[PDB]
Each structure stands twice: as C-alpha cells, then as structure tokens.
C-alpha cells in the first residue's frame, strides 16, 4: 500500500476523468524508457525489485464504497484486491509469483488465495458468462466495485464476483494495454452506454502476449509470423507488422532486450 496508488471514481465519471485515470495507470506501470518500434515495454521481471513490483488502483463508486486492486507491473494484470480488513488473490501460476504477492496488503490479517486463477477462460466459467455477454461501461464498473466490496461480508456470490473481476480487468488492465480498448470504454462513457465487447476487443485481449512477442522479435517492425485477430463482425484477419498496431497497443510485456 506504500506501493503507488492511482484513484478512480465512477461517481460522475467522464471521458476526461477516465482518460486521466488510464494515462496515470500507464505512467505507474512503466517509465516508458524502453520502447520498441514506438511501443512502450513494461519492466523486465528479471531485475525488478519487489518494492517496485505492484501498483494499486483504488476504485470508489456512487455509494462511497472503495476497493483497491493490485496490478503486476510486469504484465499490467490484476493479481488480487483489498476491501477493508480482507484481501483476496487469484491463485498464481508459479511459486515466485505467489511469493511476490505476499508483499501486498501486509497489514491485512485475513488474506486468501482463491481456488482459481485470473485467466478469462476460468473467470468466465465461474461468472456463468463469457466476456461477449458481460456488459462494460461506467454502470458495470460501479456494480463491480460494490460486488467486490460486499464479498468479504457474504453479500456477493461467486458468479457475481467473477463477473466483477472480468469487468475490472478489461476496463483497467486491458484499457491500459491497448489504446483501442481505452477508446472502446471512452465511447461507452461518452454516450452513457453499457455493452459487451465485440470480437475485435476479445481477440486483442487474447493476443496481447503474442503481439508483444511478434513486435519485439520483428525485423525493423516486420513480423516473422503473422498474428491473427478478428474484426468487429468476427471475420479473421492477419497483422504482418507493427505499423498498424501503433494506434492500437500501448504497453507490451517484456520479451527480450532491445
């Protein structure tokens, strides 16, 4: 919690306030000193001290309820959250990451590891819905904050919790990773809309790792192997070099030295 905190509220959220927020999140995720073919890279986990491993996003809503998500700076993804005197973490994929996560919310007695990881395929199963059937927007994020808040006192069932994680991860982590997805959320906020993400957003989320690898292994930006994505109508298309992604992808996971 001495980790850096970025605050956002859904109470009176605007295009501007959400933009300020996502830009602030990006600026705390990485210094931006490391850029490949114009795209910033997140810090290398190798060489990253534990006291720089995480950032905290404190979310508040119209009900003045507040929860604090923790993001891993190496991949911009949510690893867990605190509400009051309880905190909860996805089951990590390995022992090194699990050890790092013990450095989060250390003043909380009641810390828990969920049975499940935070990958979307499992969260969707637990939520009882796929990402394409879960609405995003200021309303959904407001609801997700309350759901995360009431989970420690028994007021939130697991499916609603998992849904709420899917909402937060996309509107925060994926929006930080992709200006495209930030823009998709800006449009929803602008027109006071809630709607689910279409295949163009889902396939970018799915392919973020693959895109990071393709860009960093490229020859002056030209991909060795095409990366496949989908358009809004679900038709498949291929990306063959970084230039078309410069307006689209804002952050990459570190894969190799420049």
């Amino acid at each position, epitope marked *: 919690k001495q980790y850096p905190i970025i605050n956002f509220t859904t109470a009176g959220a605007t295009v501007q306030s959400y933009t300020n927020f996502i830009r602030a999140v990006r600026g705390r995720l990485t210094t931006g000193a490391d850029v490949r073919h114009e795209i910033p890279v997140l810090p290398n986990r190798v060489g990253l001290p534990i006291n720089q491993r995480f950032i905290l996003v404190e979310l508040s809503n119209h009900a003045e309820l507040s929860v604090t998500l923790a993001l891993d700076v190496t991949n911009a993804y949510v690893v867990g959250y605190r509400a009051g005197n309880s905190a909860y973490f996805f*089951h990590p994929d390995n022992q090194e990451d699990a050890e790092a996560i013990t450095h989060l919310f250390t003043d909380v007695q009641n810390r828990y590891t969920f049975a499940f990881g935070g990958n979307y395929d499992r969260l969707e199963q637990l939520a009882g819905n796929l990402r394409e059937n879960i609405e995003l927007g200021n309303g959904p994020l407001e609801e997700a904050i309350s759901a995360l808040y009431y989970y420690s006192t*028994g007021g939130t069932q697991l499916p609603t919790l998992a849904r709420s994680f899917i909402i937060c991860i996309q509107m925060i982590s994926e929006a930080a990773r992709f200006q495209y997805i930030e823009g998709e959320m800006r449009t929803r906020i602008r027109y006071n809309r809630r709607s689910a993400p279409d295949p163009s957003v889902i396939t970018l989320e799915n392919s973020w790792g693959r895109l990071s690898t393709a860009i960093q292994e490229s020859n002056q930006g030209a991909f060795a192997s095409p990366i496949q994505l989908q358009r809004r109508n679900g038709s498949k298309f291929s990306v063959y070099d970084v230039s078309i992604l410069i307006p689209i992808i804002a952050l990459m996971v570190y894969r190799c030295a420049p």
Partner: nanobody
Framework: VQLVESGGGLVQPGGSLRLSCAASGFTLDDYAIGWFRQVPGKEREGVACVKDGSTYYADSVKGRFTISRDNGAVYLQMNSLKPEDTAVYYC????????????????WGQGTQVTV
C-alpha cells in the same frame, strides 16, 4: 482468523483420524486450502493442499493421507498413522503447488493436536 481446525486426538499406530477445516460464516469451496503440520521445535510443513484442478501431497504422507472437499469444509483423512505423524495441524488459505510448499501470508489460528 476464520478458518478453524477440528478433529485432532490420540490414536495408535495404524490408526485413523479425520481433521476438518471450516468457517462458520462461509464455504471454503472458493479458496485454495492447505493442511500444514508443525512438530515442536520446527516450523510449519505442507501436508496436503487443494486448488482448482489439482491436489498435492507431501511425500511423507502419500498414499496414507487424503485431502478433500465436502460440506463447505476441507477434510484431511489420515490413515495408517505413524508416530512420525504426531504434530499440531493447521489449515489455511494458501497457494497449492507440487510438494506443498508453504508460501505464507502469516495468519494462523489454534490448530488441532494429533498424537500417534
């Protein structure tokens, strides 16, 4: 702490016990749960743990102990008990990996005593 151990006691070698880990206000189904052992003079050792899709055991207890979920609780069925199994047993929500390492959040409760 909310996760409470019960079921400890005295048995002879070859004997059996079933320990329970539960919370009065909520189901443990949503959480990764491990059973850990601490014999006097050392530090807590992973015995068995459960998460989504995986169960792991310490080599010491393979084929003798069983961890399972039922009744919103997590049980440790201990069979063919050896004197080497004597310890205070603790349950907690902790990560579950091969070899049941303890990657500790640091909050524990009273545990339950087992004597063989």
């Amino acid at each position: 702490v909310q996760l409470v151990e019960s079921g400890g006691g005295l048995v002879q070698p070859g004997g059996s016990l079933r320990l329970s880990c539960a919370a009065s206000g909520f189901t443990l189904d949503d959480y990764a749960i491990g059973w850990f052992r601490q014999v006097p003079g050392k530090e807590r050792e992973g015995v068995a743990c459960v998460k989504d899709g995986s169960t792991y055991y310490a080599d010491s207890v393979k084929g003798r102990f069983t961890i399972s979920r039922d009744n919103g609780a997590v049980y440790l069925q201990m069979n063919s008990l050896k004197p080497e199994d004597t310890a205070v047993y603790y349950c907690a929500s902790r990560p579950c990996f091969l070899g049941v390492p303890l990657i500790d959040f640091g909050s524990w409760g009273q545990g339950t005593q087992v004597t063989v």
